[PDB]
Structures are given as C-alpha cells and as structure tokens.
Design a protein around this ligand. Structure first.
Ligand SMILES: [Mg+2]
Ligand SMILES: [Mn+2]
Ligand SMILES: [Mn+2]
Lengths: 155, 149
C-alpha cells in the first residue's frame, strides 16, 4: 500500500520515529498480520517508493534473516509484539546478541551488519529503510571458514 | 585504448584471460609504469582495467567489489592475497610474478605485502562503481562502508 511520508530520504533517527509512530497506528498494519504455515518468513509491504521502504514482519520461532547488510540503506526496527534477537558479528566469533522486546526499537546507519533471529513465535515488528532497500548483502561462510558477500537485488 | 571484447559483462575466467593477454602486450601498458600509482587501461560500460604499481607498504584493506567479478595478473614482483576467516586466522596466499587469479562477485579480500616495485594488472566486470570497505571497532564488531568509487 502507501503511507503519507515526505519526498526525501530519512535518516536513522527519523526512521526510528517512523517505526514507533506506525506501531501506535494499528490502522496502518493490522490487516496485513499473517503467520505463514510454510514457505519463508511473512513480510508485508506497507510502503515502497523512491525514498523509503516499510515492511511488517510476522515471525515464527525458526525465522532467521541470516547475516546481512543493507548496502547504502539506513534502517530502523520496532518490535510491536513479542521479542527478537538483534545480532552483530564479531571477528573473534563471539557475536554480540541483544534481546529487543515489545515496545522497543533501534536504528542504524548504512554500514550496519546484523542478523535477526530467535523470535518468540507470533512476534510482530515494523522495519523501515531509507534510501529504499533495493540491494542487500548476504554473508556466507564456506567449508573452510572463508567469508563471502552475495549482493542481492531486493527491489 | 579500446578492447575487442564481448559487449556484455565478463565472467571471472574471461577477466583472467584479459589481464594475462594484456600482460603479454607490453606495448599497451609499459609507458604507464610509475612508482599506489594506478593507470586506467580501459574503462567502458562492461569492464574496468587498471595497471597498478606497488610500494611495500601498500594495503587495499579488506573489501568486496559489490557486484563485480575480478582478476589479477602479477606482472613483476609479488602480492599477498588474503581472504577473511571467522576466527581471525585469515587465509594468505603469495601470488608471484607470472601468476594470476580471478574471483566472482561475492569475493572478500585484501591485497598487501607487496615486494617493492611490484606491477600488476587488475580487471573488473561490471565496472567497479561501488565497493564495500570493512572496518572493525575495538569491540571486534564489523561494519561495511559502501563507497562510490
Ligand atoms: Mg501520534
Ligand atoms: Mn536487516
Ligand atoms: Mn579487490
């Protein structure tokens, strides 16, 4: 669908404001809540234009974004219901893990590498990106431990 | 100078052939050696080709090439090609004069430890309009800065 947002990029603080205010306006997203039986994680587009993408994510316990960056996009997350783990990678291999629970939010600039997983079944969250999430990088590790980054189109 | 190439992005094997073919035609690059000093050999919608001359201290840092495949031919001297491992015990390979290698677009690497006065030819396809430069804070938490060439 469409939100009534400005015709410019939003910075990470404005993205955080956006996801929190959307959480306070269930009229904008309640209809799109859905938890898939199988397939991938359920993601509903609330808004996609030249400046901002907004998605509503409904989580099963097994859902896992994998390690990824957002190329040039800043981002923010608000947990509406439930809880998620925000993970940040450490070269040593002892990664940073933070539980983000309902009511809480965070933002990040474009250099962010993270992984969201460990969700309470039935969790609901709102995610916003500016500039739009037209590209993301997905990291993988081979047999040997060697790390790669696959650039993915997500427009 | 213009290059007779397919009118499309080239894969890592084709890029390796290209840098080795160019290394065999000194007429095309000899004049541009200089002591990283870099000379553009050809850039168009599909490929970026460079000649690089190395000082012993030169270091690319850890980086990816976003969507670009790449290849390297060492013409003289030697380079160290490093690939990152989770755990910190990175893979390091000396690439000596006469040797070349290539990689697809998911490659993360670092080039460094060059014998002083090394000369190499590098090719990318699609052109290297963007790259990712990795950094580590004192924590060890890694980030990727996306940079427009
Ligand atoms: Mg209000
Ligand atoms: Mn993300
Ligand atoms: Mn490189």
């Amino acid at each position: 669908g469409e939100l009534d947002l400005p015709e410019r990029n939003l910075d990470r603080r404005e993205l955080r404001d956006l996801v929190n205010e959307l959480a306070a306006h269930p009229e904008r997203w309640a209809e799109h809540v859905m938890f898939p039986e199988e397939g991938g994680r359920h993601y509903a587009s609330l808004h996609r234009d030249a400046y901002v993408d907004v998605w509503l994510l409904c989580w099963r316990a097994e859902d896992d974004t994998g390690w990824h960056d957002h190329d040039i996009s800043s981002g923010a997350v608000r947990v509406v219901a439930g809880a998620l783990k925000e993970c940040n990678p450490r070269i040593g291999g002892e990664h940073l893990e933070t539980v983000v629970s309902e009511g809480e939010s965070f933002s990040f600039g474009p250099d962010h590498i993270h992984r969201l997983t460990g969700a309470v079944h039935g969790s609901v969250s709102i995610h916003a990106y500016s500039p739009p999430l037209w590209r993301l990088g997905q990291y993988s590790i081979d047999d040997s431990g060697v790390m790669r980054r696959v650039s993915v189109s997500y427009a």
